Curated annotation (Swiss-Prot):
The lineage of its organism: Eukaryota, Metazoa, Chordata, Craniata, Vertebrata. Transcription regulator that plays an essential role in erythroid and megakaryocytic cell differentiation. Essential cofactor that acts via the formation of a heterodimer with transcription factors of the GATA family GATA1, GATA2 and GATA3. Such heterodimer can both activate or repress transcriptional activity, depending on the cell and promoter context. The heterodimer formed with GATA proteins is essential to activate expression of genes such as NFE2, ITGA2B, alpha- and beta-globin, while it represses expression of KLF1. May be involved in regulation of some genes in gonads. Residues 18-29 are annotated as: Interaction with TACC3. Changing residue 15 to A: No effect on interaction with TACC3. A zinc finger (C2H2-type) spans 8-30. This is Zinc finger protein ZFPM1. It is found in: Nucleus. It comes from Mus musculus. The chain holds residues 328 to 360 of 995 of the full protein. Mainly expressed in hematopoietic tissues. Expressed in the spleen, a primary site of hematopoiesis in the adult mouse, as well as in the liver and testis, but not in the heart, brain, lung, kidney, or skeletal muscle. Among hematopoietic cell lines, it is strongly expressed in erythroid and megakaryocytic cell lines. Expressed at low level in several lymphoid and early myeloid cell lines. Not expressed in mast cell and macrophage lines. Expressed in the heart, where it colocalizes with GATA4, GATA5 and GATA6. Belongs to the FOG (Friend of GATA) family.
Length: 35
């Protein structure tokens, strides 16, 4: 596979995302602005 699976929980918080790509864009919140 590659992605598209549930154990993609955020490294900083604990938000789980379907794809790594979602987690990547999410990451910015933990310094830029929380959203
Ligand atoms: Zn997070």
């Amino acid at each position: 596979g590659s992605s598209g699976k549930r154990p993609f929980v955020c490294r900083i918080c604990l938000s789980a995302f379907t794809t790594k790509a979602n987690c990547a864009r999410h990451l910015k919140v933990h310094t830029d602005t929380l959203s």
